[PDB]
Write an enzyme that holds these catalytic residues in place. Structure first.
Site, short mmCIF file in Angstrom:
data_model
loop_
_atom_site.label_atom_id
_atom_site.label_comp_id
_atom_site.label_asym_id
_atom_site.label_seq_id
_atom_site.Cartn_x
_atom_site.Cartn_y
_atom_site.Cartn_z
N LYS A 46 0.82 -1.21 0.00
CA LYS A 46 0.00 0.00 0.00
C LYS A 46 0.84 1.24 0.00
O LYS A 46 0.35 2.34 -0.28
CB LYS A 46 -0.96 0.07 1.17
CG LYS A 46 -1.95 -1.08 1.17
CD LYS A 46 -2.88 -1.03 -0.02
CE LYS A 46 -4.19 -1.76 0.34
NZ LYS A 46 -3.87 -3.06 0.90
N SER B 121 -2.24 -12.74 4.18
CA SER B 121 -2.65 -12.70 2.78
C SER B 121 -1.52 -13.15 1.86
O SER B 121 -1.79 -13.62 0.75
CB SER B 121 -3.12 -11.30 2.38
OG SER B 121 -2.03 -10.40 2.28
#
Lengths: 8, 310
Positions: free
Chosen positions: B41, B271
């Site tokens: 991100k 993840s």
């Protein structure tokens, strides 16, 4: 636990 | 050279070949935890701010407000500090105290919403704050802002092309906002021109992409794979460029992350385990056993020290 865009 | 602030140092993450997944080294992982605030991100926090500056929707006066309970909040926080913006983040009470101590440490104006309300409660309050003084507040909207997949098209994708010398055959990536798989696929298919297989990964507990593409009822659900499984199709997920959808369950995602640690010495988040588990499955199909499979690992383990991972 994550739902509806949570945790992003 | 020398970056003028931390936002400009995003990217150039390494590819590492796996030894206990895949078949004879056909699975390679891109370690996005090696980034200024230690997740993928960081790229979209930087570029969404950059684009809003180039668009004038963000000026020295303006203040950032967003709704995010994950890595995008940390990313916007480090970028706002590196570039001199005040920032407000909203989130449910659900959040770990460490994630909140981190955000306060980065100087965020934390605004806490009702836990039972969840993500919707947070995005609601943020929009009200933005309604207070629309000329003072800027919401960047990671799920819809095209600057999100655009930075993956200009950096993450080309990095994968360059580091594999055009040999990448498959990209496997969990979908949160969808920007990673969208940007990477557009860069490799459209700018470099190679017809790879783009594989989206979602929790089996919330398989809304599989269900949508299948024309089945869309049944979102709770899961433990932090960073993916939004429970809806995000605007920044370009369905038209997705060739394949793999579903992974939370326990397998968690087990695979621990295997990455104990067998590969790779400190990956949960993840990251989901994406590798989906990659291992493809890599052991004879139709992919000779292909080079590149797997995005979005974050690092220590984001999860006090969760089900350990």
């Amino acid at each position: 636990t994550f739902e509806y865009g949570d945790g992003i | 050279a020398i970056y003028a602030d931390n936002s400009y140092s995003i990217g150039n993450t390494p590819l590492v070949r796996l030894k206990h997944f895949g078949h004879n080294g056909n699975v390679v992982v891109k370690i996005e935890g090696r980034n200024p605030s230690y997740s993928v991100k960081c790229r979209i926090g930087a570029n969404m701010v950059w684009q809003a500056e180039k668009d004038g929707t963000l000026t020295k006066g303006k203040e950032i407000v967003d709704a995010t309970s994950g890595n995008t909040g940390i990313a916007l926080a480090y970028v706002a500090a590196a570039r001199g913006y005040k920032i407000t983040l909203t989130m449910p009470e659900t959040m770990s105290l460490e994630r909140k101590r981190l955000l306060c440490g980065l100087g965020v104006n934390l605004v806490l919403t009702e836990g039972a309300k969840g993500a919707k409660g947070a995005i609601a309050k943020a929009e009200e704050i933005v309604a207070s003084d629309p000329s003072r507040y800027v919401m960047l909207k990671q799920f819809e802002n095209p600057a999100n997949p655009q930075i993956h098209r200009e950096t993450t994708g080309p990095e994968i092309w360059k580091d594999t010398d055009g040999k990448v055959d498959v990209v496997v990536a969990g979908v949160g906002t969808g920007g990673s798989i969208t940007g990477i696929s557009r860069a490799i298919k459209l700018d470099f021109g190679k017809q790879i297989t783009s594989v989206a990964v979602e929790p089996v507990e919330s398989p809304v992409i599989s269900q949508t593409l299948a024309g089945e009822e869309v049944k979102p659900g709770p899961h433990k794979i932090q960073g993916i499984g939004a429970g809806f199709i995000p605007k920044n997920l370009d369905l038209s460029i997705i060739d394949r959808v793999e579903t992974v369950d939370s326990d397998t995602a968690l087990a695979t992350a621990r295997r990455l640690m104990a067998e590969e010495g790779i400190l990956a988040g949960i993840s990251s385990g989901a994406a590798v588990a989906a990659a291992d499955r493809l890599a052991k199909l004879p139709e992919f056993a000779d292909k080079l499979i590149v797997v995005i690992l979005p974050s690092a383990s220590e984001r999860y020290l006090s969760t089900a991972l350990f």
